[PDB]
Structure 1
């Protein structure tokens, strides 16, 4: 099957009904960190979290920064946008900080209790009407109701397809964020500008030429 490395052997725990049935498996586990079932399940959830968060972040970086290259939508650099926003704001940053901590903490605790017991927050009467749709959809990391409103989880055909594309694009978004911050440390410039420069001359616009990544040269 599609392997992260042909010829090489497949990790046993990765070569399992659950794992190969999880998503996007390629036998990629050199250090063998998901031999425990609970562990690999936790890591699957973790990878999901990171995928989605990174997708969101890279979108919020590029699209506004992309259209600021366009005439409209004058937005600052992403890293300075924090300063820009706290300037243009009204509430103190520590305040709004603590508030959003409360907010995220509650729902994160929800996700937590549900991972502990899939039928945990379905506890009837615990909320007024939540429990009904607040139950999982038999796949931890795939809730229902408000989650998937349009009802795209019902058609099994495109199911694994959505899944594979999800995990793919999420990992790629992680990598995108990493490249952005890395070239912000090295080049110090916005990623769009880094791209423009590498377009103007790839032969001389690269980490090979930065003398930063590879200083021994």
Structure 2
């Protein structure tokens, strides 16, 4: 009858607590219109996990090359330490290598993403799935919830760091002046 995250708005009809990180947070009702259309929230959850995991990797990579040495610097020595300028300075060889690897990996991902298989657990691509062999159901759900929390935090973190580096050029307590 009422959301848990926002305790003065109605609970989203689409969300019903049967998902990791379901705290009834949908003021717009994007989930509501999705289920009214006829879809299911598997796609949005998988997009959440994908965006988040990318955001965590990119958060660490935003500050690593400055706080720690920018590699042994055979070719990277020319490229600036500012992440917003490093993107426009990768050499063609390295840019093509990384682009090809990402493209092949996500072309592999696409078929299972857009399949009709119900066995597919959302955000379960088999990469390092061996540590859940011994985990219990409560442990599995709680670990997936820590994953989702980290995802959700890193997504906002990149927006903060990107806008701060664009408008100020410096993150305040950590990396400065880059």
What's the TM-score bracket when you normalise by the shorter of the two chains? 0.7 to 0.9
How far apart, in 2, do the equivalents of 1:83 and 1:116 lie?
33
Which of structures 1 and 2 has the larger relative contact order (alpha carbons within 8 angstroms, sep 6+)?
Answer: 2
How many residues get paired? Answer: 160
What are the within-5 Å matches in structure 2 for residues 144-163 of structure 1?
144=126, 146-149=127-130, 151-152=131-132, 154-155=134-135, 156-163=137-144
1:137–1:143 contact (8 Å) kept in structure 2: no
Q: Alpha-carbon deviation of 1:113?
A: 1.0
Q: What is aligned with 2:153?
A: 172
How far apart, in 2, do the equivalents of 1:41 and 1:185 lie?
34
Q: What is aligned with 1:140?
A: 122
Change (3 A) 1:118 1:143: farther
2:56–2:150 contact (8 Å) kept in structure 1: yes
Moved beyond 4 Å, runs of 4+: none
How far apart, in 2, do the equivalents of 1:83 and 1:11 lie?
42
Q: Which runs of 5+ in 1 are unaligned?
A: 69-73, 87-91, 120-135, 198-217
What are the within-5 Å matches in structure 2 for residues 29-68 of structure 1?
29-35=26-32, 36-37=34-35, 38-67=39-68
How far apart, in 1, do the equivalents of 2:122 and 2:157 lie?
26
TM-score (norm 2): 0.74
Larger radius of gyration between Structure 1 and Structure 2:
1
What secondary structure, in the 3-state scheme, does the structure 1 residue paired with 2:108 have? Answer: helix
2:3–2:11 contact (8 Å) kept in structure 1: no
**1:181 and 2:178 matched:** no
